[PDB]
Enzyme design. Structure first.
Site: not given
Ligand SMILES: [Cl-]
Ligand SMILES: *[C@@H]1O[C@H](CO)[C@@H](O)[C@H](O)[C@H]1NC(C)=O
Ligand SMILES: *[C@@H]1O[C@H](CO)[C@@H](O)[C@H](O)[C@H]1NC(C)=O
Ligand SMILES: *[C@@H]1O[C@H](CO)[C@@H](O)[C@H](O)[C@H]1NC(C)=O
Ligand SMILES: *[C@@H]1O[C@H](CO)[C@@H](O)[C@H](O)[C@H]1NC(C)=O
Ligand SMILES: *[C@@H]1O[C@H](CO)[C@@H](O)[C@H](O)[C@H]1NC(C)=O
Ligand SMILES: *[C@@H]1O[C@H](CO)[C@@H](O)[C@H](O)[C@H]1NC(C)=O
Ligand SMILES: [Cl-]
Ligand code: NA
Lengths: 342, 189
Positions: B19-21, B1, B94, B71-72
């Site tokens: 993000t790519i997780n 992220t 994360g 998603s966070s």
């Molecule tokens: Cl960042």
């Protein structure tokens, strides 16, 4: 130098990408141009974090209209996905089956259609150069490479770009991304359709399926970024805060802040050890109350979250949670009433 | 992220989290295109998989075709009543993105920390489940004591908590900070 700038600013997680966004602004780009140009670059210098294989959200504020909007370009489950597709963490974290449909490029396209001022191609140019020429590996990527050294060194296709002499690159060592360079070039010239319904598409599908995945061309053809004219907002003093609602965590942030605003924090809140300590205790408890509610959230097109979200953004409801924060103790999990069904 | 914040000369702004997780996503790189594919499927909840010890599956966040996982992420823009941008802020890194974003805002808006200090200030995290307060290595240890005497079990993050990029309007213009935890640096004019 100082990082206080009279006219404009870009804050990215790599210096070179902050500069690349800054140069787009300087050449007449909107904030959106600068963000896209910088994001293409971060996708290279911090390849572990994000890129065109992923998805994104943009919260965009227009100073003319005084309107904020949000662009949802987060990945989606493929049409062939189902609730019980995975049986361990391992299956949902590694290989093709773990891959959701990427939205990144459709997200750039939509933000650019609505807000762009430089040509699409111009946005990719600096990153094409960077990927071909190479760059020294920065602090963040180096630590990520170190963290994943085992998985990276045992997979030849990753080691192809991420290793030197069969070992992960370290900080200062040169990284080149020659295939991404070509791909970025195709995107620059052919546009977004190249990824979703054009010359990159069949290869994308074949790479995901070779690794065991289930994304198909139709999934790509059907992907759509979404404009949200009314982001979440909350009022804080004389200010408004715009943030994305579900499926992102705006409602959690809204709830944390609305709980805490009733304590009237200021410089005094952290001036002595007695106050500081109580202040941080209160912060943590607000975190705990805010998370209790989070497990009722999901994609609002598949889950009805209007009530949940309405509570999470309500100052009254936050006042009810704040009155349950004890200044002298934290509590067990059940005290916060976490909920898993409505 | 990764998180990015932009303010342009006209006063328009962008807060962008992408993000790519997990690190390197699925670990699937195309040998032909060089695309590195996300493992965003892992942000769904799954009835079989045991997420944490004691943490149940959340039915609101199960996989369905065409569904987006929770998603966070929280890219945020603060605008003053006069219509001018006050802060552009977001985090990466994360599970602690939302609390790190809250802390950056608290630090600057309430504690009066300038943007660089707001970004660099030590952070902490608790998400209810699991049931532990994580603090960064260099947190004021009077805070650690204040938590422990109030019965929090604290532990020290072995690396760092989240990554924050932020811009804030000042008298001097637009003040920008990138988080040294990842090694970025701002640019402007
Ligand atoms: Cl960042
Ligand atoms: C796991 O089990 C389910 C239910 O038996 C099955 O449908 C699915 O294909 C399995 N998936 C994996 C990745 O092992
Ligand atoms: C503000 O609104 C105008 C007209 O509606 C639009 O063309 C432009 O995209 C917006 N400004 C910026 C910097 O995006
Ligand atoms: C492109 O689009 C059309 C309809 O959207 C579809 O029939 C065609 O198969 C797509 N092509 C590729 C290469 O994915
Ligand atoms: C905040 O939330 C809703 C949008 O649906 C509405 O009450 C209002 O228009 C918003 N406030 C601002 C300042 O945009
Ligand atoms: C919203 O909060 C009220 C308490 O103010 C509660 O009674 C109601 O059940 C809540 N609704 C949801 C969906 O959580
Ligand atoms: C959770 O932690 C807190 C203190 O850190 C404690 O009060 C509680 O008993 C712990 N366990 C549960 C199940 O809540
Ligand atoms: Cl490459
Ligand atoms: Na700075």
């Amino acid at each position: 130098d100082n990082h206080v700038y009279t006219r404009a600013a870009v804050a990215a997680d790599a210096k070179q990408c902050s500069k690349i966004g800054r140069d787009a602004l300087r050449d007449g780009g909107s904030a959106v141009d600068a963000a896209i140009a910088a994001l293409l670059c971060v996708g290279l210098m911090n390849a572990h974090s994000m890129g065109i294989g992923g998805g994104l959200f943009l919260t965009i504020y227009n100073s003319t209209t005084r309107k904020a909007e949000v662009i949802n370009a987060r990945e989606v489950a493929p049409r062939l996905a189902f609730a019980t597709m995975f049986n361990s963490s391992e299956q949902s974290q590694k290989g093709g089956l773990s891959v959701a449909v990427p939205g990144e490029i459709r997200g750039y396209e939509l933000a650019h259609q609505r807000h762009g001022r430089l040509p699409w191609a111009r946005l990719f140019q600096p990153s094409i150069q960077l990927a071909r020429q190479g760059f020294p590996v920065g602090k963040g990527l180096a630590a990520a490479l170190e963290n994943k050294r085992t998985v990276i060194e045992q997979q030849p296709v990753l080691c192809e770009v991420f290793c030197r002499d069969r070992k992960v690159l370290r900080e200062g060592e040169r990284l080149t991304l020659p295939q991404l360079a070509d791909t970025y070039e195709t995107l620059a010239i052919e546009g977004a359709q190249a990824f979703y319904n054009g010359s990159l598409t069949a290869q994308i599908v074949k790479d995901i399926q070779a690794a065991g995945g289930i994304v198909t061309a139709e999934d790509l053809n059907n992907y759509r970024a979404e404009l949200i004219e009314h982001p979440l907002n909350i009022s804080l003093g004389d200010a408004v805060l715009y943030m994305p609602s579900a499926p992102l965590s705006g409602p959690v942030l809204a709830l944390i802040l609305n709980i805490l605003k009733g304590y009237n924090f200021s410089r005094e809140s952290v001036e002595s050890p007695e106050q500081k300590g109580l202040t941080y205790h209160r912060i943590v408890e607000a975190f705990r109350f805010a998370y209790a509610k989070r497990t009722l959230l999901g994609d609002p097109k598949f889950v009805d979250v209007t009530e949940v979200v309405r509570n999470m953004t309500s100052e009254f409801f936050a006042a009810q949670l704040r009155a349950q924060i004890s200044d002298d103790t934290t509590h067990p999990i059940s005290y916060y009433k976490p909920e898993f069904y409505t | 992220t990764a998180h990015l914040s932009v303010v342009a000369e006209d006063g328009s702004a962008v807060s962008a989290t992408s993000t790519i997780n997990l690190y390197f996503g699925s670990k699937v790189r195309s040998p032909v295109s060089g695309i590195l594919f996300n493992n965003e499927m892992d942000d769904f909840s799954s009835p079989s998989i045991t997420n944490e010890f004691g943490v149940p599956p959340s039915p609101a966040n199960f996989i369905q075709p065409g569904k987006q996982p929770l998603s966070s992420m929280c890219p945020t823009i603060m605008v003053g009543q006069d219509g001018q941008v006050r802060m552009v802020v977001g985090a990466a890194g994360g599970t602690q993105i939302t609390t790190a974003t809250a802390l950056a805002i608290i630090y600057n808006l309430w504690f009066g920390y300038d943007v660089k200090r707001a970004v660099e200030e030590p952070r902490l995290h608790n998400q209810l489940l699991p049931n532990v307060t994580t603090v960064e290595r260099n947190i004021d240890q009077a805070v650690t004591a204040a938590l422990e005497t109030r019965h929090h079990h604290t532990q020290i993050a072995s690396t760092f908590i989240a990554v924050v990029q932020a811009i804030v309007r000042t008298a001097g213009g637009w003040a920008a900070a990138s988080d040294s935890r990842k090694g970025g640096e701002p640019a402007g004019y």
